[PDB]
Structure formats: C-alpha cells, structure tokens
Design a protein around this nucleic acid. Structure first.
Lengths: 1041, 171, 86
DNA sequence: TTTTCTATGACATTTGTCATAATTA
DNA sequence: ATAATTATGACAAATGTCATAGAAA
RNA sequence: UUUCUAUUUACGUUUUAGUACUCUGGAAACAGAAUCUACUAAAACAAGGCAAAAUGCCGUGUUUAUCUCGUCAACGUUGGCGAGAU
C-alpha cells in the first residue's frame, strides 16, 4: 500500500541487495538480494573471436568456390578431371615455366587462392607466443625472396627441411600476386585465356574487405556505406542526440581534461586558491605547449611559488604526480612546428579523429590529402605513422566546447558544471516511460560487470516501486571491487598484510614479555609509522612505554569527524592526552600556530614532509590532512571533505546517480537519491559490531544493504549533519559527539534478528547457449568390442611433461604403439629405463644426444616423434559428426553435450525426466523450436508412455522441490543414470561444507529415478517472493528468442 | 633490521633507484653501499629498518600461478589465476565452470592417487559412472591431493582446454 | 637490530656503564640515549647490533637441562635432570 | 627525444671514540 | 679511600637528504 | 571510466587420399598386411538454418519468474502490448 520507506541498495559484482526501512520507526518491511552469474568480458570475446573465425572460413570457402566456378567457365577445370594426385608446390614451380596440364594448372590456381597471405604488414592482431613476430617474419622472408618467387622458396624448404607448414610460412600478398601473374603470363600462351580472366583471377586472389566496409548485404552487424560507418563506430551522443560522439585523444577533449586538472589544483597564495582565466591561459600555453610531459615542479617554477603549497591533484600508482598532457599537440610539434597547423583547433581535431578511426596508414594519408588544409605532402607521410591514438567513444565535441568555455571563465569542476547546466540524457524520452528504462545503461561506458549490475539494480527498483509504492529516498552503494580477478588479488594482498602485522605483534609480545600487545595492535601500528614521535610535540615515544602505560597515549583524529567523515588509520595518530585535550575539534594548522603546542608549525611541516618521504610511513592523504591550512568552517571545504570521503566519485556510480536523478526530475517525483562511499559502510558495520562472520551465505549482501538504508535515517534525525545531507543528495563537533551520533545501537538489533531474507536467482532460458565442447577426438575399436577415445600425448620433449613416463611404467599397452608398431616401443622403453631418474627422460636424452626419439628404422632415416597417441577411456555420450567426414574407417565424436533443460513426467506413479539437450533446439529465423523428432526419440529412450502426465519443465536456476527440500538446478549431470545437480538456494554448498568443516565433494547431485515422492516447481520474482508455479500441460516448443 | 636481510636486498637484482622509491631511502646511499664506499654498519637504524621492512615482503615470496588455456582452435581463451595450484583449479571451476575440464577429473585423480583400479568404477568419457562405489571410497579416509597434482588435473583434460600453459611468477 | 629489544635494554635496571662495558658501546652514548640527548634511530647499525645482541642473552630463562652419563664401557648409564646446572 | 639508470658530491648534522669532571655510599 | 657509576663535551669522520653529472636505453 | 564492433594472416583438433615408415609372402616385380609415426593435398571445424554465382548471410553475448486476462503482431502457438493474479 502507501507506506513511507527508505530504500537501500548494495550493488555488488555478483549480487544486488535491497532493503526497506520504515521512515518513522526504523522498521524493516522487507529485505532481499537478487543474484546473477558474474558477467565476464571473456564470453563476449568468445562469441566475437569465433564469429571472426566463421567469417574467415566462409570467405576462404567462397573464394575457393568462386575460383572453381571461374575455371569451369574456361574449361580448365571440369568435374571429370582428377585433382587428387597433383602436388601443388611442384606444379607452381614447373608452371613458372614450361607448360602445366589442365589439372596441374587448376590445382595451382586453387592452391594460391586457398592461401593469399597478409596485405597490411602490421594489420595482424595476434600474440608473439610463436617467438617470431609477424613483421619480423615477413622481413626475413622478403630478405630471402629477392630473386626467388614464393613457390621456389616453399619447394626448397620442403626438400631441405622436410616441412612447409608452420610459423615459417607467413608471407605477404604482394609476392603471391607476383607469382600468380608470372605463372599466368606463361600459361596463357598455351591455353585459351583472356585478359578479363587474368584480371578476374588476380582480383579474386588479392581481394579483401577493408575494416571500413564490413560484412555484405543483409547482415545485422553491417552498414551501407562510410557515413553509416562513422555513425556506427561513434554513436549518437546521449547529451545531444543528433550530434555524434568525438574521439578522446582529440585536442579539444585533451584541453578539457587538462583544464579539469588545472581547475582542481589548490595553490596557497595571496591570490585565490583556484587559478583564474588569465593565469590559466598562461599556464596552459607555457607548460602544456613547451614541454611534452608536464610536472608539478614546472608549474611551481612558472608561477614562481613554492611547490609545497600545491594540493589536490591526481597521482599515479607509484606516487609520481600525474598531469594529463596534450599528446596530439606535442606529437604535431615533434614533426612540424609551423604556426598555421598548431593554432587551428578544428584541423587538430580532424587529424585526431582520422588517426583514431583509420587504422591503416595508407587510408590516413589519403584522408588528410582529401582534407584541404595547409599540410604538405612530405609532412603527411611522417604524420601518418603516429600511434597510440585508440579511444573511440568520448563526450561530444559540441558539448566539449560548451564545457571548455565555462571551465576557462570559472574555476568550477565537471560535476557541478553538469548540475548547473542540468544536462539530461536525451537518447530516450524519460517523460513517456512508465518505469526507469534499462536502455540508458547501455550508453555510459561501463565494464560489463557494472552494466549487468546496473540493469539488475534498475529492475529491482522497478519491482519495489511497483510493489510498495514510490520510495522517499534511495541510497546506492557500488562495491569497490571492479571484477572477481580483483576480489581475489585484494583478498590475497590483505591476507599478506595481516600476516606481516601478526609477525610484528607476535615478535613484540616475546620481546616485551607481556601480552598487552594483544589489545594494543591499533597503537603499535601507529607507533612505528610515527617512528615513536609525537607528531604534535616532536618528543620521542618509547614502544615499551606504550605497552606498560597505554593510557599515556591516545589515538587522536587529525581532522574532526563532523567534517572529515574519515575514520581510517590515515586520520589517526598517537598523541599525549594533554596534546589531544588542548587540540580540541580543530585543525593542526591553527593549533601548531597557537602557543599550546611545544613545537612551531614550520618545524612540524618540515618534520612531516621529510618523514612522509622516508620509509613510506606517511600516506599521501595523511600529510594533506596534517597540513590542511584551509579553514574547515568554509562551506566549500566541508563539501570537498564530504565528496572525498563520503560521496562516491567513480564514473560508474555518478552515471547511475545522474540517470536516476534525471528520471525522477523529468517525471516530477520528489525522490532523493544519494550515494555512500565503500569505506563508510565498513566503518558502520564495525562500530555496530555486526561483523561476526562473512560465510553465512548471501544474506551478507542483504544485511549491508539494510545498514546502507539506515544511514539515511541517521542523516535526518540530527540537524548537525543535516546540511551535509543536502550536499550529498545534491556545526563543528567533537569526536565524542560523533560517537554519540553514530555508535548508538538502538533499533539496530532488528538487522540482527530479521530471518526472512528472501533470495532470488536469475533464470537463464537463453537458447543456443553452447552446444558441444570443441575437440574432435577420434575413436578406435578394441578387442572387447567397445570404442575408446584416442587422446594424443603432445610436447613430449618439453622438460616438465612426464606423462609418457608415467604411462610407460604403469600401462604400456595403452600407447597405440604397443601393438600397431612394436619395435618403436622397444626404442622408447630402452630410453626410459636408462634415463629414468629424470622427471622427463626424453628431455635428458635430448640434452646428451641432441636427437629427438626417431621412429625405428633399418636405415635410421625415420621421422621425428612429437605426438604419441594412446587409448584413454571408453565412449558414453557423443555428438557423432562422422557423417561430415567421408568414408571414415573409425568413428569421429565430440563429448559433453551441454543440456538445455529437462522435463519431468509422472508415469505410473514414478517420476522420470527427459533431457532436452541444447543440440535439439534448431533455429529457424527469429523463433527457436525444439526438434520434434529428436525430442520424441529422447522421450522413448526413457521408457515413457504416451499418456504420462506432464509435471514441469526446468531450465537453469529454476527452483525445484524434491521430497520437500528446495534446491536450484544447475543442470542435469548424467541423463542415463537420471542424476540432476542442485546447489542450495541460500548458501553455495561449498560454503555450507566449510561452516561444518565437512570434506564431502562440492556439488550436491540428487537422483529423480526412484524413491522421489515429489518434484514440484517453485519460482521467485526479481524481488524474491517464492510462488509455487503451476505450469502448462504441453512442454514449451517455440521460444520467441 | 637484521644485517643479513639488508645484505640480501643489496645483493638483489632490483635497481638501486627502484628500492629507494619503495623504501624512501636515497639511491645515493644504496648505490654507495653496493659500490662499497659505505659500510652497512655505519647506517642509521631508522634507514636500515626501512630497507629491512622492504626485504621482509620480498623474503616471503608468494608464487602467483596464472593458467592460460586455449581451446583447440586457438580461438576462445580461458584464463584463471591463484596462489597455489589448488587455488588455480578452484577458480577455474568457479569462473568458467566444472564442465570446461574433462568430466569428473578431480575424482579420477583422487581415486588413482589412493591406488584404486579406475576400471572397476567404470571410468567413461562421462567419468565415474558407478556413483554407488565412488561414494563408498569417499567414506574411507582417502589420501588427499598434494597441491602438485592439481597441475596434473588441468593437463589431463583435453575436452575443451586442449592447449594448457602455466606461468609461475615468484615475488 | 630490533628496536624493541634495544629499547628493553635501555629501559632495564642494568647500569648504563655496566651495559656499556659488555656491549662495547660508550657509556656516554648510553647515558645520552637514556637522557634523550641522542635518538636510537641515529645510531650506527654496528652499535645497534651490539646492544641487541647483549639484550638477547638475558632472555635465556625457562631452561631445563638433562645429564646423560655413560660408564666407560658404554654399558651402565647414569641420568639426572634439573632446572639450572646446579 | 627523453627519461630513468648509476655515480659523485654538497652540506648541515650526527656519529663513534675518547676523553674528562663529578658523585656517593 | 675508592671504585663504580653518571653526566657532558671534543673531534675526526662519517650520515641523511638533497642535488647534479653523464650516461644509457 | 575501456565497452561494443570491424577486416586479415599463420597455425591448430580430425578424417580420407597419396608419398615415406614397419612387416610378411618373397629373388621380388610387386602383392599385400598394419593404419603406427612424419610430412602433403583436399575436405569438415560448435548441431544446423537461409540464400542463390553474390568483393555473399546468420549460429557460443547482452536482456528472462510462471500463470493469466484481454489488445495487437508474428503466425495454433509465440510475440509484443497493456491489466491483473499467483
């Protein structure tokens, strides 16, 4: 119904937790968490790389087919002719002279066509695992091909080295074209050829689709011409719809980023701390146009002030000050320095766009040539070889100019410019839409994990709005981890840091001889960081004295928590009780200025600066907090502290906040949405003592969310921070007041006691997900009549691979060699026995004899042996593709048929199920339909009668209820044995085992074949309500897809 | 600040300037100690504690093993990384799923290491097919894998990850 | 040269001169360290090591000693054990 | 180009060594 | 008586923290 | 903040065919046998679905409770629409 409530979100990487809090009574209407499999860039890299292959294979087959059709036209190739025996390499060399028979000629042309070779030498996109780069390989081949054509080099390699294929046969298309035309000029004198045929064949040989032409007609991933190419590569700007987004390395956008940094810088001087228009122009010109990489010292020298007074700039991971440089402008000045080029913003922009979109240098030089500029021909060739310009989607140029104008005139930053101008996304009209539209999340450039999390969170918001009405306030937390590979790296680093501190603590306990260190960890961490020096009075402090008399030292906060909002060790120090009492709720600047301190401010600053550099014991923010000369009473300074410590600033959170704010503003809904920093929730978890454990399952992602919502209620019951709320949504107090405001654990036990934490998982009905694992294992037939898969041993000569050894000693009869070729087994065995001590006897044999294990021969002319094949295991499930490979004496199979869904039937009182495998979902146009014949065959294979009643059909993650215990299906394990796989709904089983320290295997596998009293289907909405689902009486055949 | 550990950092291949940025000590002093124009004994405890704290982390080298596995066509690539090979297997079965490696490989290796005959349990491409017996073997105190054989678990699976190459970084 | 152990020696009831004689470091330096006229941080590693080594010996308490004595023929064996050799 | 690498030194300050002068029980 | 202990120096020779020098890539 | 696409090369897993290998009959021409180990050509490379001599085109990613009402669309079931319920 209509109930005022605060909504809180915990937007993780693999979950989105939601919580509802009563506006009045701190109550909890409903909590929960939506789940989803972690999005990964890899999968999409999968579909794309494969698509890229299918296309290469299709183009190769089409070129072969077109050449074959062309040669039918001239009667050179006919169906009766046999091309089986002709050798391609020997025919190309002969035909470079003499004459070729009609067959040999056909073989040679078809042969060059199958392999044209690379065209743009650097165009290749591949790793250097082959140990020879593509460009170096072509360079060596060209150095070898001065007087010899391609065929000659390949034939010479086959006769001398014995091989042609491999990584040595990477060539360039020009040599192939030269060989083709050279052979054709000779062979046209004997056969009926015309210049039209010659041109057609050469075209077919060197033809290729440029990166700006795309696929042909009718493709969903294509474009009609090059204007549409710009539109697709750039996209329409969300801020101004009709204008297209510009490139990022372009000069105007470089100026915008650089001006952001310049505006952010704070310089302690008699003038304003923020630089004004004229000196901003002076600094930008001098620094960013005379020096390639700007540094802070250069700025300090040009404004002739102390570098010590400059604060508030981005820093690299290594601590070096970072300033974004006009890379394109300096790159221009490197080659040419004329005035006519460097002071033309439009020319520099167009140059940047061309370099960024046009990968090939030949296209770049042509496009600058078509641009009627002052560039000269000699300069264009040099400029065309510029690199590193690789950013495609960036704020539109028309908006960039508007932001730059405001930046030049005023000292503001981008966020407040956006708020002032009230720039609103216009790609989708927010007025007409009934609910928040998930389309807008596509445009902001966010990693796929964050994109999926945002879409799920927006759907959760839509569901909650539809259920409990309009939310008075929404609080959104995006979690710190970007992706899982970072959650582990961070957890590992934190574990290592925890271990090093434990090693310090345990050593201290032994040296002191006392156990006081057990509760003194916070102070002892501070002591060595301050090197036993009271930062407020410089007096030396003994570590032993801290253990003996812990009350003589206290953990004071550098900045009052009423404004700093920071509770990290960076904002903590060990000080004399008298020092802390005298300091009060103020800043160290005015206190060291005051006579209370027994040291002067300048000496304090000198000690702090030298200490910060030495031993890396003072963090970057710690010295800024210590040396914060600006008065905290100023509204701008309190706002700055709130933003750096309480308001998230990462692009992702901002974009989501801006989208939600725009949606609520357009529809005129009085909904305040606000963000919370990642460390703030950790602190509020610590001070309310809710951190008992992190393995209670997924309910953790819910509980944190609840706390997030509670933050709102503690930002409106107290007027002292109320103004700060107005800052976050869009007096000075001591630390005990801060503790009174936040520590108070009243009506927070509700989070401890709430047990009805609804959970939900994302069903994955998508068809065509994957079909068969790809490794076309061959098979053989053994004596007992079975069929065995023949896995192949590879990399035998490598130092660490000992498989051959283990197999030889344990089971020789498994190597195919044992029976089909015995002598060679004898040679391998004699080698294994003599050098058996080494992990890899073959490597040790190579290290002393320098010969690979050759096949046994009477003349010792045998070939090398690099792959030995062996019988492996028996065959149970297989997609037999033997029909594709013609006349195959032995079967060819693929394994691991990935199941799509399974349907449960109740026949004669017993429950069975038929597995609709993904291979049985054929695709016709838009609809995806279950192959009726294969489905019927599978149904009959399970011994299912025709009157069997239909109960349900389960996809992935649909909730099942077997004998009364709810579970979530992951997929059927083995269909023949009737085994399905379920992981519990609340906590992943792996965790359920650790909270009991059991060692049972990690995947619950349950059996539906018999003794299964009930198999019902339960389903849960995005929020998480559990509603038993009564399904239809015929299994679904057509999914719209 | 043990003299031996500082002596180890000085003997390290790390650049004098690289250690200086991390420790906060001057490249000048580190370079002069290495040259031998300065005695480690004459150094202050403050500066030596800094060089010592640096070595501490390097001394306890943590191996990071990154698994790069390519599908047979060299087209789709699967990559997982963790501290001990056991971690590599645990991440690969979480991120990319168990059905990427050969079916039932963890069980097959455990049975083989204990010493049981695989044929009795009906080893198949699907793997252990006699679940009833496997459950009995699990009941007996099995001898666990030794974190040097999870490598074998990854290199005996060719269903999808045909080409497997492990890179081990020590730091 | 662990700072904490050297700190224990300096805060010990042992005489500054007595520590100095065993360490080999000057009583002057020891006094100025206890006075605070000097800082432990500015001490040469050589001097710091001597102080650390001297403090390490005092932590030899809690020892238990056993005596295995065999007669010349290695046949009859006498064995006694106690806290301090005494 | 340019940007870190070792090497060498400047300078203000602090060492280690080697003294005293005193002190107290 | 007297001896061990406790405070300050003097001085030659270092050291930390800044540079620069020239090179090297 | 770094996603989404685009073109291309070499490889690579597999079968068949050929040339080497191994073996037997055997003086062997050769006949075979074995299909093991190397090359070499051609073919297939997620099941398949369109299209129709085209520098041809889709198929492993995003979006997903279920049931329902009606509305509309594809085509009876799916949509999509909306409005509910569970």
């Amino acid at each position: 119904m209509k109930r005022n409530y605060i909504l809180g979100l915990d937007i993780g990487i693999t979950s989105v937790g939601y919580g509802i809090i009563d506006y009045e009574t701190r109550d909890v209407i409903d909590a929960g968490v939506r789940l989803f499999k972690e999005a990964n860039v890899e999968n999409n890299e999968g579909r794309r790389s494969k698509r890229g292959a299918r296309r290469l294979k299709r183009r190769r087959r089409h070129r072969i087919q077109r050449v074959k059709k062309l040669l039918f036209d001239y009667n050179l190739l006919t169906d009766h002719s046999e091309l089986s025996g002709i050798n391609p390499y020997e025919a190309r060399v002969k035909g470079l002279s003499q004459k070729l028979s009609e067959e040999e000629f056909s073989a040679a042309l078809l042969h060059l066509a199958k392999r044209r070779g690379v065209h743009n030498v650097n165009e290749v996109e591949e790793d250097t695992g082959n140990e020879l780069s593509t460009k170096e390989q072509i360079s060596r081949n060209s150095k070898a091909l001065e007087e010899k054509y391609v065929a000659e080099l390949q034939l010479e390699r086959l006769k001398k080295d014995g091989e042609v294929r491999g990584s040595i046969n990477r060539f360039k298309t020009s040599d192939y074209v030269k060989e083709a035309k050279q052979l054709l000029k000779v062979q046209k004198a004997y056969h009926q050829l015309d210049q039209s045929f010659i041109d057609t064949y050469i075209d077919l040989l060197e033809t290729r689709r440029t990166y700006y032409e795309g696929p042909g007609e009718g493709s969903p991933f294509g474009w009609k011409d090059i204007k549409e190419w710009y539109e697709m590569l750039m996209g329409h700007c969300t801020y101004f719809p009709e204008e297209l987004r510009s490139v990022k390395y372009a000069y105007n956008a470089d100026l915008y980023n650089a001006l952001n940094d310049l505006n952010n810088l704070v310089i302690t001087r008699d003038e304003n701390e923020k630089l004004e228009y004229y000196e901003k122009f002076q600094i930008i010109e001098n620094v960013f146009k005379q020096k390639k990489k700007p540094t802070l010292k250069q700025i300090a020298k040009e404004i002739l002030v102390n570098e010590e007074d400059i604060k508030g700039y981005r820093v690299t991971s290594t601590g070096k000050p970072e300033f974004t440089n006009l890379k394109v402008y300096h790159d221009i000045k490197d080659i040419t320095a004329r005035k006519e080029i460097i002071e033309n913003a439009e020319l520099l922009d167009q140059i940047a766009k061309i370099l960024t979109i046009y990968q090939s240098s030949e296209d770049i030089q042509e496009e600058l040539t078509n641009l009627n500029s002052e560039l000269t021909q000699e300069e264009i060739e040099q400029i065309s070889n510029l690199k590193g310009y690789t950013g495609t989607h960036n704020l539109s140029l028309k908006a960039i100019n508007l932001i730059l104008d405001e930046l030049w005139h005023t000292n503001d930053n981008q966020i407040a410019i956006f708020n002032r101008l009230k720039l609103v996304p216009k790609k989708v009209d927010l007025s007409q839409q009934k609910e928040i539209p998930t389309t807008l999340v596509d445009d902001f450039i966010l990693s796929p994990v964050v994109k999926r999390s945002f879409i799920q969170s927006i759907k959760v918001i839509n569901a909650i709005i539809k259920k409990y009405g309009l939310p008075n306030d929404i609080i959104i937390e995006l979690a710190r981890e970007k992706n899982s590979k970072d959650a582990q790296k961070m957890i590992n680093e934190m574990q290592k840091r925890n271990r090093q501190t434990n090693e310090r603590i345990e050593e201290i306990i032994r040296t002191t001889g006392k156990e006081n260190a057990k509760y003194l960890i916070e102070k002892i961490k501070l002591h060595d960081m301050q090197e036993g020096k009271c930062l407020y009075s410089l007096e030396a402090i003994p570590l032993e004295d801290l253990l003996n008399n812990p009350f003589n030292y206290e953990v004071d906060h550098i900045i009052p928590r009423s404004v700093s909002f920071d509770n990290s060790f960076n904002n903590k120090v060990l000080v004399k009780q008298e020092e802390n009492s005298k300091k009060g709720n103020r800043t160290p600047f005015q206190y060291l200025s005051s006579s209370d301190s027994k040291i002067s401010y300048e000496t304090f600053k000198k000690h702090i600066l030298n200490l910060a550099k030495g031993k890396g014991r003072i963090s970057k923010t710690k010295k800024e907090y210590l040396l914060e000369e600006r008065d905290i009473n100023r509204f701008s300074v309190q706002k700055d502290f709130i933003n750096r410590n309480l308001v998230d600033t990462r692009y992702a959170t901002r974009g989501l906040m801006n989208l939600l704010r725009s949606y609520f503003r357009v529809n005129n809904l009085d909904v305040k949405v606000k963000s919370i920093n990642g460390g703030f929730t950790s602190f509020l978890r610590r001070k309310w003592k809710f951190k008992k454990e992190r393995n209670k399952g997924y309910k953790h992602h819910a509980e944190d969310a609840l706390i997030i919502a509670n933050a709102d209620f503690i930002f409106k019951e107290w007027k002292k921070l109320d103004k700060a709320k107005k800052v976050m949504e869009n007096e000075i107090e001591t630390e005990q007041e801060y503790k009174e405001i936040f520590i108070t654990p009243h009506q927070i036990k509700h989070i401890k006691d709430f047990k009805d934490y609804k959970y939900s998982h994302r069903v994955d009905k998508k068809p065509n997900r994957e079909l068969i694992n790809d490794t076309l294992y061959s098979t053989r037939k053994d004596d007992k009549g079975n069929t065995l898969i023949v896995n192949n041993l590879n990399g035998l000569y490598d130092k660490d691979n000992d498989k051959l050894k283990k197999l030889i000693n344990k089971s020789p009869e498994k190597l195919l060699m044992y029976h089909h070729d015995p002598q060679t087994y004898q040679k391998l065995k004699l080698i294994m026995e003599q050098y058996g001590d080494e992990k890899n006897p073959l490597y040790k044999y190579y290290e002393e004899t320098g010969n690979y294990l050759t096949k046994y021969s009477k003349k010792d002319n045998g070939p090398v042996i690099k792959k030995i094949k062996y019988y492996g295991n028996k065959l149970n499930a297989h997609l037999d593709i033997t029909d594709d490979y013609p006349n195959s004496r032995n079967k060819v199979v693929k394994l691991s048929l990935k199941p799509y869904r399974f349907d449960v039937y109740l026949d004669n009182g017993v429950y069975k199920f038929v597995t609709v495998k993904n291979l049985d979902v054929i695709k016709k146009e838009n609809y995806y339909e279950v192959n009726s014949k294969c489905y019927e065959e599978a149904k009959k294979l399970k011994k299912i009668s025709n009157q069997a009643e239909f109960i349900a059909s389960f996809y992935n993650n649909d909730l099942i209820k077997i004998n009364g215990e709810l579970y979530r299906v992951i997929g059927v394990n083995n269909d023949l044995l009737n085994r399905i796989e379920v992981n519990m709904i609340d906590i992943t089983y792996r965790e359920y085992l650790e909270n009991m320290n059991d060692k049972r295997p990690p995947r619950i596998i349950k059996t539906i074949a018999s003794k299964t009293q009930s198999i019902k289907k339960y389903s849960t909405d995005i929020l998480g309500n559990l509603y038993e689902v009564k399904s239809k009486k015929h299994p679904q055949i057509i999914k719209k897809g | 600040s043990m003299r031996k550990t500082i002596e180890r950092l000085l003997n390290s291949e790390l650049s004098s300037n690289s250690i200086a940025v991390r420790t906060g000590v001057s490249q000048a002093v580190i370079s002069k100690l290495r040259n031998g124009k300065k005695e480690l004994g004459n150094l202050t405890l403050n500066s030596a504690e800094k060089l010592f704290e640096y070595q501490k982390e390097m001394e306890k080298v943590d191996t990071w093993i990154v698994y790069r596995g390519r599908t047979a066509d060299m087209n789709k690539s699967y990559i997982a990384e963790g501290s001990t090979y056991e971690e590599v297997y645990n991440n690969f079965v979480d991120k990319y799923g168990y059905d990427v490696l050969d079916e039932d490989i963890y069980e097959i290796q455990l049975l083989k290491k204990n010493g049981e005959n695989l044929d009795d349990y009906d080893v198949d491409s699907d793997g252990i097919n006699n679940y009833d017996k496997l459950d009995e073997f699990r009941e007996s105190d099995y001898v666990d894998l030794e974190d040097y054989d999870y490598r074998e678990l990854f290199e005996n699976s060719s269903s999808q990850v045909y080409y497997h190459e492990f890179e081990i970084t020590h730091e």
